[PDB]
Design a protein around this motif. Structure first.
Motif, PDB file in Angstrom:
ATOM      1  N   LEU A 112      11.564  -6.352 -76.178  1.00 56.23           N
ATOM      2  CA  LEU A 112      11.875  -7.711 -75.768  1.00 56.23           C
ATOM      3  C   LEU A 112      10.634  -8.416 -75.230  1.00 56.23           C
ATOM      4  O   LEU A 112      10.407  -9.595 -75.500  1.00 56.23           O
ATOM      5  CB  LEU A 112      12.981  -7.708 -74.707  1.00 56.23           C
ATOM      6  N   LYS A 113       9.837  -7.673 -74.470  1.00 52.14           N
ATOM      7  CA  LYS A 113       8.659  -8.212 -73.799  1.00 52.14           C
ATOM      8  C   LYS A 113       7.580  -7.143 -73.694  1.00 52.14           C
ATOM      9  O   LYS A 113       7.883  -5.965 -73.489  1.00 52.14           O
ATOM     10  CB  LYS A 113       8.996  -8.715 -72.384  1.00 52.14           C
ATOM     11  N   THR A 114       6.327  -7.556 -73.831  1.00 51.37           N
ATOM     12  CA  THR A 114       5.212  -6.688 -73.496  1.00 51.37           C
ATOM     13  C   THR A 114       4.524  -7.287 -72.276  1.00 51.37           C
ATOM     14  O   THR A 114       4.044  -8.426 -72.312  1.00 51.37           O
ATOM     15  CB  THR A 114       4.229  -6.519 -74.670  1.00 51.37           C
ATOM     16  N   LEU A 115       4.526  -6.522 -71.188  1.00 55.07           N
ATOM     17  CA  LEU A 115       3.998  -6.963 -69.899  1.00 55.07           C
ATOM     18  C   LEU A 115       2.515  -6.639 -69.804  1.00 55.07           C
ATOM     19  O   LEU A 115       2.131  -5.473 -69.670  1.00 55.07           O
ATOM     20  CB  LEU A 115       4.759  -6.291 -68.751  1.00 55.07           C
ATOM     21  N   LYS A 116       1.685  -7.672 -69.875  1.00 48.84           N
ATOM     22  CA  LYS A 116       0.249  -7.479 -69.932  1.00 48.84           C
ATOM     23  C   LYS A 116      -0.400  -7.954 -68.639  1.00 48.84           C
ATOM     24  O   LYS A 116      -0.034  -9.003 -68.102  1.00 48.84           O
ATOM     25  CB  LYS A 116      -0.336  -8.225 -71.130  1.00 48.84           C
ATOM     26  N   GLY A 117      -1.355  -7.183 -68.126  1.00 50.25           N
ATOM     27  CA  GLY A 117      -2.057  -7.596 -66.919  1.00 50.25           C
ATOM     28  C   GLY A 117      -2.850  -6.501 -66.231  1.00 50.25           C
ATOM     29  O   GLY A 117      -3.937  -6.750 -65.700  1.00 50.25           O
ATOM     30  N   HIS A 118      -2.300  -5.290 -66.218  1.00 48.30           N
ATOM     31  CA  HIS A 118      -3.031  -4.141 -65.701  1.00 48.30           C
ATOM     32  C   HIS A 118      -4.298  -3.921 -66.515  1.00 48.30           C
ATOM     33  O   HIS A 118      -4.334  -4.207 -67.713  1.00 48.30           O
ATOM     34  CB  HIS A 118      -2.168  -2.875 -65.727  1.00 48.30           C
ATOM     35  N   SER A 119      -5.329  -3.395 -65.867  1.00 50.45           N
ATOM     36  CA  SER A 119      -6.632  -3.255 -66.511  1.00 50.45           C
ATOM     37  C   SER A 119      -6.922  -1.800 -66.861  1.00 50.45           C
ATOM     38  O   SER A 119      -8.007  -1.472 -67.351  1.00 50.45           O
ATOM     39  CB  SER A 119      -7.734  -3.817 -65.613  1.00 50.45           C
TER      40      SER A 119
END
Ligand SMILES: CN1CCc2cc(-c3cn4c(n3)CCC4)ccc21
Ligand SMILES: CN1CCc2cc(-c3cn4c(n3)CCC4)ccc21
Length: 305
Positions: free
Chosen positions: A93-100
């Motif tokens: 449904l969603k890909t949560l992007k932000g962690h490095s």
């Protein structure tokens, strides 16, 4: 009951690399597993029957968690993302992007409108499920984050880290409310709230589990006898029958303690590698356990009490 009598019922084979996490669905029907083989698998909770595989991550998965209505999963991956899955359709449904860096741990809040995550990048992030956007980045720790968990009403988050700290966060404000410091600070490899939310259970890489009154900031119980010096092993409160503490161990056993007396009441033999993950069924006296690369299997154990 003074001692449980868990016995092996089913062995679940299918993952082709180390299993990382197993979780029972809140409705009790399913078990989800994540693995280094980049897959999520779904299994019947009561018969161990393989149901389906959910794919999409580009690298291994470290954790998976259920929404409260048992319809969604969130997974945390070495590919630096989390994914939200509709279990019935298999769709991402969603890909949560932000962690490095690698995402290591994840959980829904009870309302399941939020996801919390912890990463090798030393941060804790709070995400909106419906939009997939990151709402807050918490400067949580100074080493990789080993676990994150919401309390019973989702108002608090607890996080743990190899920096030796457990911290308690206000979900709404993002403020750090508590830092738990013992008489020493070995790396903390796991943490979660007790079901009533008054305690936190914390694993440290000195073969020790501890039950904390986090408000008072004091240790109430200590559990030992198992081996845990290297891996981040899940631990649990077993509440359906006798009140136990359950954990995997690096001697390939599942350990079960009496929560109150701190005495070991059972050791489950069967796995052939480190037992990295255990989970407790929400209504039946059933434990799921999963092991690392040399074993690759998941086991379902049942007790009369
Ligand atoms: C393939 N490997 C090796 C050991 C290991 C450990 C974990 C893990 C994740 N989380 C925990 N352990 C505790 C809380 C969240 C995931 C993947 C792997
Ligand atoms: C919670 N912490 C402590 C150490 C650690 C290590 C890793 C990790 C995963 N992978 C690697 N390091 C290399 C290839 C895959 C992830 C999380 C954590």
């Amino acid at each position: 009951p003074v001692k449980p009598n868990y016995a092996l019922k089913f062995t679940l084979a299918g993952h082709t690399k180390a299993v990382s996490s197993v979780k029972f669905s809140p409705n009790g029907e399913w078990l989800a597993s994540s693995s280094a083989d980049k897959l999520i698998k779904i299994w019947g909770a009561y018969d161990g029957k393989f149901e389906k595989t959910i794919s999409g991550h580009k690298l291994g998965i470290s954790d998976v968690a259920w929404s409260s209505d048992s319809n969604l999963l969130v997974s945390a991956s070495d590919d630096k993302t989390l994914k939200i899955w509709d279990v019935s359709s298999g769709k991402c449904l969603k890909t949560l992007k932000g962690h490095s860096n690698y995402v290591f741990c994840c959980n829904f809040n009870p309302q399941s409108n939020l996801i919390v995550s912890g990463s090798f990048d030393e941060s804790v992030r709070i995400w909106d499920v419906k939009t997939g956007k990151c709402l807050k980045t918490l400067p949580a720790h100074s080493d990789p984050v080993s676990a994150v968990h919401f309390n019973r009403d989702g108002s608090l988050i607890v996080s743990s880290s190899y920096d030796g700290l457990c911290r308690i966060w206000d979900t709404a404000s993002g403020q750090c409310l508590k830092t738990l410091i013992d008489d020493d600070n070995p790396p903390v490899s796991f943490v979660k709230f007790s079901p009533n939310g008054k305690y936190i259970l914390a694993a440290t890489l000195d073969n020790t589990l501890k039950l904390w009154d986090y408000s008072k900031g004091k240790c109430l119980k200590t559990y030992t006898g198992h081996k845990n010096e290297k891996y981040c092993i899940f631990a649990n409160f077993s509440v359906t029958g006798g009140k136990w503490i359950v954990s995997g161990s690096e001697d390939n056993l599942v350990y079960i303690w009496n929560l109150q007396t701190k005495e070991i009441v059972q050791k489950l033999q069967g796995h052939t590698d480190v037992v990295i993950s255990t989970a407790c069924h929400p209504t039946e006296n059933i434990i799921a356990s999963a092991a690392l690369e040399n074993d690759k299997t998941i086991k379902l154990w049942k007790s009369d009490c």
